[PDB]
Design a protein around this ligand. Structure first.
Ligand SMILES: [Zn+2]
Lengths: 241, 289, 252, 287, 286, 363
């Protein structure tokens, strides 16, 4: 086992500065107002966006100024090799919900759908590292498929630090190694970060490196996603007439 | 009987079977529309640092000086004369609350719904209590919009007796961006039925009567020769939509005329679906030009 | 650890599993037999309606907390809470449950909604509460019958009563359908079944079943047998309700 | 109940005083409030009050069967409770988002940074190990918690002492604090968070915000640090668009702030030990 | 939900032996079956029946057997009724349906003759296999139970438990010996694993694959559990309505026939797929 | 390209599960030789040389066993050039830490050209796994494909008057199989003889413990007969001569007869026939373990990823211990203390755990 061979390679067979081929799709589930699917390697996220619709059981929470974003997270039991129970209600899925919510409330541009629920839902079928970013990106594709206005692709990814170098788009192996992993989600057009999570010990001067590396990885993810989206829009329009 | 299982086949994307190479201007969020002296913005964009930035996925449209976007999937925004079909959800002391494919809960004021025949004097408490016994929760109404409020909601009414409550019929829910904005959504086809094409994504299909406003329920049977046609139209509409093409009189009539050889059930299997849709599309395209 | 109950031990296994013996088998009996039934309505005071049913080791209560504010949308509701006392059955289970209590609750609700007429109880929810003091055989059927008695007692409207009956399958070489069995005949069994009907209009209201095996004809014979059993049981419940009404007339 | 709403007057006044770089009580932007660290009688209790925000911290131990994946190292159990005395809105089971985010943040910060030695606290590898839980309680709510919660957990976990144990083979013998002298814990480095608050989409940033500043802020950047300049965690909340230089500067700030807080904590522990070595069951330190 | 006149339309249609999809009363619809979707599992499957999409994972873990039955292992079922189906599900609202479905799935397998668990025992009272099945809902378009059952069976058929030798040793030291032959993994028979069949009664005629719009029009529904032989493991009843004693028999006979057909088709399909091999490329969600 | 490789694993919690990893087959990997354009010209770092001369050109690549048993034949400077693979290096890493470390320390030398080639992540030489073929066969076939691939590549590059590759084995089975696969192949002995250089080259080359019966049988046998308990003790003299004192003095030698005792325990000695005796005893069980925290130091494995580390106590009368700590950075240099937890039937060392650190040596 190892993380960075002396040559520069990883285990999976990719250098530090690159990442794994995301393979996505938009339009899985038709009974909804927006759906997506993404596999950022072995990972497999799945998003859904029930559009800006009415509040029931009003319970005096229908914001009159803006819209109400309600995003729910879920990590299937058979996702990890170690089976787990209680995928919802846990103290971690709810944190992921908070994160997604404060991201998309920033991006989703709610000032135009006042007194309306935007219900986001995310299910992770398979997890092999990078479990938050895949979900961010799937939910982004969903939002877009639902014609919901949004400032910019909110593209997310993760970086890490090993042997005085920065890795991009960690996997489960180096995620279990305990090294510093920094996940983030930014808006490329403006260069602004919508979220910045991070969990491990490391020096300070080694921060700018992993930071710009994660940013560049997110730019690449932006390229791939936008190519997908453009193919989708082109095909749909062609089919219209 | 007959049951059949089959594995999933992989899609064939790029729609190369057409080969169009459209002459449009597609965009996605973050994209920068032409930045010039005083260009007005419309639905599907916004401004940042003196720069016009898209907000939604679709093609850009530049009317004389107005820049707008025309997304490919949305929820029904309220116009002012568009007809509409709606499923009721609630009955408030003053009005009815209706569900369209809209971003809020459409509203039919008790003042709007027409009365049995033309017995028009005014609305009193007796009408406020018949507010329920006539228009049950869950029923359907074929109306046209009256106005759009600043909060986004849509108040709709019933101009005449051709509108109001609907019979038994059948219904479909499609996307609202797949019905051509045109006139006479209310069609009565030669096949032996009639159809209503909402400016929203609610299509209604009812057998055409012989006498020629919903105040009575004719809960009689329907001749097989008029239910088979309705079912075929239903499946043909679902076919059309699954292939992402527009929807109006000629489209449905020609998919119908195409699906006579293929029986009333075997025309959702994606191969038959696709070939019927291709035939219809080609013949429309060639006849119209 | 639950912070709403007393601090007990983490785990606790019973002694039987540590026993060493071949438990006694029942043997033979008249397959079309029924146990002696004691059904009385009007037991409990603080409840609008209550009923109690005993059949062998089976001992069940049911109470009905009446209409409590909470067309096809202004249609009544009834929510049923089945609950076996922790001191019933060879083994102990914490009060909550969460596996079979809810299944049997769904069963009771699906078997009661038909009989009860809820158009005359709009905007209201009837809280039915069953309690199983001792398990000795057919339990869900006793619970249906007891809930029916409690409802008819509280004076909720209906179309007809609900009578249940439980059946089992003898795993012998010539398997015969055993009617109204015991917990022993039920733990030493291959298949189990439960019918519940409304005998006047002769309509099932809710049934259920399961099997180490079986076949169409066998299940059908089981069904009809349980129907006959329920018919033969109805008069007991009839007399019980009449008796309770007479006692009420006496009180005033 | 509910928190009294915020008037537009106060909101605008605050935004303006920020524009002009004026806090309310009279301090700058790169300043905390006087934080006091007071100790109790029982090893493991600490009341830390920054300005008006008081938080209590207790540390307790147990012996339990470990988890199979880690049969060598022990366990650690965080918990933060928001007592209804902290503020009205803190009814039980209602403000769950805040509980979740705070607890996850604190767990992450302390546990995953490897602040203490989960190995040193092994007794029987496979059968019985220690279990250190830490209960923080919020008493008064005026502004900054994470900083207070962290300072409390740290002062406790550095001011706690275990019942000594002897072992031979499998024979394990626990003893009482009166028969022997309890043994302290094993810390490697003491991290304590630092909270920055963003106003006007990112233009202005403050330290140790009060409750009002938390009501008229859009974003919160938490940064955990040590005296050795080692990022342990950083988090952005509030749905806000920051940049790089901002986090760099905030980190160069957290450095100094944590250094100073750490000096104080050490002084507090020193004074408490000195007192108990002279007769007295308390210990007090002031910023 | 829906109105009353639509219900009249649908019920007279059934009574006339037609349906909005122009199909009779004994006709399912094309069910797209797939297997080996997810990789981290010891078995998996996916179904798309009209507009209901189910995923199923199966994990073979090692655990202590059950005291009353140490000679063999056990199946456990969990059911995530993800809100992605209908937003009216959440962290608390889907527990109801999940519990119902799980209790059913258990009731289908307290049979002792469906999955030969004796084949899942390593060392009695000491170690055993445990099959954690995990159903995951993604749409609700009716005929839910039948699809869930088909997925359970396709996943079992596609399950590959590894061989393990658990060798005892003195002084309480245990060792597990694997077989480094992922191609030599054992396979459990499914010649008895049953399919569910949901006969919903509409008017005076019974129907299979009861689409939602038709479920709302009904009053009772008999669930049967059939094996490829013809027996009937389970026979449950669900609905807020009544049900005659005679119609039960017709329902059961029809369930028998439909189960025969269903199991035949599934067996043929999955043998086909197992034959093809990795050449299939495993198109899923793409 | 992309390849999904699966494999099973035994957990720490006495369980089994599965992993499914990815494997990217890059085609931009370098041979190490400058001449081979279409592989990359500007390629610095450790790399080969254009004209080698000790079949004069003679690049070569060895197999695992050679790295494991003749590294000194290679560490020598009389040679100049050689190719190294990935599988060889991975196996070396798995078996021996020192050998792997030496090979890395040499690959770090720009002069002694131990250019490495990542075959696993290459589109051509890579080879999948096959049912009925152990991992050793996997690696062997991979090395053969690499050799064959190397011969073709360097063949088409130029006129072949400049470079030719060689395969090197230790046992002749592999060599003969290679020949039957259609390539050159030698053994290290033939080669190291063929160069007729200075003789320095040839000069630089020329337990499972018994069971333990439970306390029941021991206590039953002592009273009844043969077995007898006593205090075990060792000596600074030798790791094998030990003395048991009965409650008389028995002696016993050999790591088996020393069936997992320690300076002060309670062993259940059995007596050996008089054909070996001053007497000679044997151990079959323990009545009472009597341990204590032993002070010492943490000798690490140079692998900075490894968790298992060896511990040396101070009293020579104790065996080193095999502990699990992850730190291995703060402790080396500081006397620690460790507590023993067992001695199963597989390890010449026991399993312990850290309990506290004291301070650097010398203080
Ligand atoms: Zn080359």
């Amino acid at each position: 086992l190892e993380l960075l061979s002396d040559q520069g390679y990883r285990v999976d067979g990719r250098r530090a500065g690159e990442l794994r081929k995301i393979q996505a799709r938009m339009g899985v589930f038709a009974q909804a107002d927006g759906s997506a699917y993404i596999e950022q390697g072995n990972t497999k996220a799945l998003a859904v966006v029930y559009g800006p619709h009415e509040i029931r059981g009003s319970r005096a929470r229908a914001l009159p100024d803006r819209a109400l974003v309600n995003c729910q997270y879920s990590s299937a039991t058979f996702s990890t090799g170690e089976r787990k129970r209680r995928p919802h209600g846990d103290r971690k899925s709810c944190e992921m919900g908070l994160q997604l919510r404060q991201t998309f409330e920033a991006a989703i541009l709610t000032q135009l759908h006042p007194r309306s629920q935007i219900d986001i839902y995310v299910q992770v079928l398979q997890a092999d590292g990078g479990t938050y970013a895949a979900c961010v990106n799937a939910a982004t594709l969903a939002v877009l498929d639902a014609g919901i206005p949004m400032r910019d692709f909110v593209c997310a990814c993760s970086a890490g630090f090993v042997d005085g170098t920065a890795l991009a788009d960690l996997s489960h192996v180096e995620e279990a190694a305990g090294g510093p992993q920094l996940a983030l989600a930014l808006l490329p057009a403006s260069g602004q970060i919508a979220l910045l999570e991070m969990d491990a010990r490391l020096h300070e001067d080694h921060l700018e490196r992993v930071l710009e590396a994660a940013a560049q990885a997110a730019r690449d993810v932006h390229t791939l996603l936008d190519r997908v989206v453009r193919q989708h829009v082109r095909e749909a329009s062609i089919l219209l007439g | 009987m007959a049951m059949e299982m089959r594995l999933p086949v992989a899609r064939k994307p790029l729609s190369e079977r057409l080969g169009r190479d459209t002459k449009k201007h597609l965009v996605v969020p973050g994209d920068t529309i032409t930045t010039d002296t005083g260009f007005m913005r419309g639905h599907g964009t916004y401004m940042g640092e003196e720069k016009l930035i898209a907000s939604v996925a679709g093609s850009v449209e530049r009317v004389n000086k107005l820049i707008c976007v025309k997304a490919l999937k949305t929820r029904y925004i309220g116009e002012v004369g568009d007809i509409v079909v709606g499923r009721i959800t609630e009955v408030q002391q003053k009005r009815w609350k209706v569900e369209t494919n809209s971003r809020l809960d459409s509203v039919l004021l008790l003042s709007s719904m027409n009365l049995p025949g033309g017995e028009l004097r005014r609305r009193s408490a007796e009408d406020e209590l018949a507010m329920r016994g006539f228009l049950q929760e869950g029923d359907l109404i074929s109306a046209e919009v009256q106005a759009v409020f600043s909060d986004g909601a849509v108040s709709l009414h019933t101009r005449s007796l051709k509108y109001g409550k609907l019979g038994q019929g059948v219904l479909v829910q499609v996307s609202p961006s797949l019905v051509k904005r045109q006139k006479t959504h209310f069609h009565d086809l030669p096949c032996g039925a009639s159809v209503i094409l909402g400016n929203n994504g609610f299509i209604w299909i009812y057998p055409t009567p012989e006498h020629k406003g919903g105040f009575i329920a004719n809960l009689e049977p329907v001749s097989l020769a008029d239910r088979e046609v309705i079912s075929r139209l239903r499946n043909c509409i679902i076919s059309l939509v699954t292939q992402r093409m527009m929807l109006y009189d000629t489209s449905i009539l020609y998919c119908y005329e195409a699906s006579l050889p293929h029986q009333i059930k075997d025309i959702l299997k994606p191969e038959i679906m696709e070939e019927i849709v291709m035939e219809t599309r080609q013949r429309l395209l060639e006849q119209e030009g | 650890g639950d912070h709403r109950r007393i601090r007990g031990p983490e785990e606790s296994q019973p002694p039987q599993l540590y026993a060493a013996d071949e438990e006694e088998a029942p043997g033979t009996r008249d397959p079309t037999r029924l146990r002696p039934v004691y059904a009385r309505a009007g037991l409990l005071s603080q409840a609008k309606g209550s009923a109690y049913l005993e059949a062998g080791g089976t001992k069940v209560l049911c109470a009905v907390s009446g209409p409590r504010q909470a067309p096809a949308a202004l249609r009544g509701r009834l929510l049923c809470d089945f609950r076996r006392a922790p001191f019933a059955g060879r083994r102990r289970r914490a009060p909550p449950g969460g596996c079979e209590e809810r299944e049997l609750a769904l069963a009771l609700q699906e078997a009661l909604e038909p009989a009860v007429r809820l158009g005359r109880y709009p905007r209201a929810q009837l809280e039915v509460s069953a309690l199983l003091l001792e398990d000795g055989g057919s339990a869900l059927a006793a619970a249906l019958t007891a809930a029916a008695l409690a409802l008819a007692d509280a004076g909720v409207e209906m179309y007809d009563l609900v009578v249940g009956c439980g059946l089992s399958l003898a795993p012998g070489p010539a398997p015969t359908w055993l009617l109204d069995p015991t917990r022993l005949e039920e733990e030493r069994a291959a298949a189990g079944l439960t019918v519940a009907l409304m005998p006047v209009l002769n309509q099932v209201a809710g049934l259920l079943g399961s099997g180490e095996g079986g076949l169409t004809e066998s299940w059908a014979e089981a069904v009809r047998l349980g129907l006959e059993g329920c018919q033969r049981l109805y008069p007991v419940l009839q007399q019980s309700l009449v008796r309770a009404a007479r006692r009420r007339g006496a009180a005033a | 109940m509910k928190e009294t709403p915020l008037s537009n007057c106060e909101r605008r006044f605050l935004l303006r005083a920020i524009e002009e770089k004026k806090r309310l009580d009279g301090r700058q932007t790169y300043d905390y409030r006087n934080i006091r660290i007071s100790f109790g009688t029982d090893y493991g209790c600490c009341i830390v009050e920054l300005g008006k925000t008081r938080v209590l911290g207790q540390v307790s131990c147990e012996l339990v069967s470990p988890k199979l994946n880690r049969a060598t190292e022990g366990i650690l159990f965080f918990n933060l409770e928001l007592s209804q005395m902290a503020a009205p809105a803190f009814e039980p089971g209602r403000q769950s988002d805040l509980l979740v985010k705070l607890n996850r943040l604190m767990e992450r910060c302390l546990r995953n940074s490897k602040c203490i030695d989960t190995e040193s606290l092994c007794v029987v590898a496979g059968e019985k190990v220690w279990q250190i839980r830490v209960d923080l309680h919020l008493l008064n709510h005026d502004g900054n918690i994470i900083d207070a919660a962290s300072i409390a957990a740290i002062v406790a976990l550095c001011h706690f002492r275990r019942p000594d144990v002897s072992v031979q083979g499998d024979e394990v013998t626990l003893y009482t604090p009166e028969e022997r002298d309890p043994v302290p814990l094993s810390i490697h480095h003491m991290p304590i968070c630092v909270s920055f608050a963003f106003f006007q989409q990112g233009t202005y940033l403050l330290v140790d915000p009060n409750e009002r500043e938390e009501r008229v802020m859009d974003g919160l950047l938490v940064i955990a640090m040590n005296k050795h300049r080692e990022i342990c965690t950083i988090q952005s909340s509030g749905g806000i668009m920051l940049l790089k230089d901002q986090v760099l500067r905030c980190s160069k700030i957290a450095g100094v702030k944590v250094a100073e807080i750490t000096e104080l904590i050490l002084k507090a522990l020193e004074n408490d030990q000195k007192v108990r070595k002279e007769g007295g069951k308390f210990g007090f330190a002031e910023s | 939900t829906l109105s009353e006149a639509e219900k009249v339309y649908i019920v007279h249609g059934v009574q006339e032996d037609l349906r909005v999809d122009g199909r009779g009363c004994e006709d399912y619809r094309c069910v797209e079956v797939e297997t080996d979707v997810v990789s981290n599992t010891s078995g998996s499957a996916r179904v798309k029946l009209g507009h209901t999409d189910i995923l199923v994972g199966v994990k073979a873990e090692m655990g202590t057997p059950k005291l009353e039955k140490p000679n063999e292992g056990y199946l456990e079922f969990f059911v995530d009724c993800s809100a992605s189906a209908t937003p009216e599900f959440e962290g608390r609202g889907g527990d109801d349906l999940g519990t119902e479905i799980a209790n059913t799935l258990y009731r289908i397998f307290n049979n002792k003759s469906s999955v030969d668990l004796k084949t899942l025992c390593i060392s009695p009272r000491e170690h055993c296999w445990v099959l954690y099945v995990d159903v995951l809902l993604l749409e609700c378009g009716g005929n839910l139970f039948d699809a869930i059952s088909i997925a359970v069976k396709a996943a079992l058929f596609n399950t590959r438990i590894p061989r393990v030798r658990v060798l005892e040793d003195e002084e309480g030291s245990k060792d597990i010996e694997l077989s480094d032959d992922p191609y030599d993994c054992i396979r459990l028979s499914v010649e008895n694993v049953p399919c569910i069949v949901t006969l919903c009664k509409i008017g005076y005629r019974h129907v299979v694959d009861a689409t939602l719009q038709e479920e709302a029009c009904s009053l009772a529904s008999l669930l049967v559990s059939v094996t490829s032989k013809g027996v009937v493991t389970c026979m449950r009843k669900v609905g807020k309505g009544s049900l005659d004693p005679e119609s039960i028999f017709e329902m059961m006979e029809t369930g028998k026939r439909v189960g025969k057909v269903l199991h035949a088709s599934l067996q043929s399909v999955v043998h086909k797929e197992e034959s093809l091999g990795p050449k299939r490329q495993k198109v899923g969600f793409l | 390209m992309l390849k999904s490789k699966t494999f099973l694993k035994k957990t720490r919690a006495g369980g089994v599960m599965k992993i499914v990893r990815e494997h990217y087959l890059r085609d931009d990997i370098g041979c190490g030789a400058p001449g081979c354009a279409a592989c990359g010209g500007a390629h610095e770092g450790p790399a080969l040389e254009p004209q080698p001369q000790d079949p004069q050109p003679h690049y070569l690549l060895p197999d695992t066993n050679v790295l494991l048993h003749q590294i000194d034949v290679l560490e020598d400077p009389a040679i100049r050039n050689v190719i190294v693979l990935q599988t060889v290096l991975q196996e070396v890493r798995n078996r021996s830490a020192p050998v792997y470390k030496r090979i890395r320390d040499v690959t770090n030398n720009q002069e002694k050209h131990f250019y490495t080639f990542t075959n696993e992540h290459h589109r051509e030489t890579y080879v999948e796994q096959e049912q009925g073929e152990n991992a050793n066969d996997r690696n062997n076939r991979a090395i053969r494909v690499a050799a064959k691939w190397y011969n073709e590549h360097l063949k088409k590059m130029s006129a072949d008057n400049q470079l030719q590759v060689i395969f090197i084995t230790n046992d002749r089975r592999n060599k003969e199989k290679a020949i039957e696969e259609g390539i050159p192949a030698f053994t290290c002995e033939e080669y190291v003889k063929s160069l007729t250089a200075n003789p320095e080259l040839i000069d630089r080359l020329a337990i499972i413990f018994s069971e333990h019966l439970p306390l029941s049988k021991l206590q039953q046998g002592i009273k009844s007969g043969t077995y007898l308990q006593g205090t075990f003790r060792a000596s600074r003299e030798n790791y094998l001569e030990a003395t048991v004192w009965i409650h008389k003095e028995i002696i016993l030698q050999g790591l088996k007869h020393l069936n997992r005792a320690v300076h002060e325990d309670i062993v259940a000695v059995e007596l050996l026939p008089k054909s070996q005796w001053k007497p000679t005893g044997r151990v079959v069980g323990i009545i009472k373990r009597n341990w204590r925290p032993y002070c010492g130091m943490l000798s690490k494995s140079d692998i900075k990823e490894s968790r298992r580390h060896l511990f040396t106590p101070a009293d020579k009368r104790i065996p080193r211990i095999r502990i699990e700590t992850r730190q291995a950075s703060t402790l080396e240099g500081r006397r620690i203390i460790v507590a023993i937890d067992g001695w199963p039937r597989n390890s010449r060392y026991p399993n312990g755990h850290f309990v506290r650190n004291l301070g650097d040596v010398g203080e």
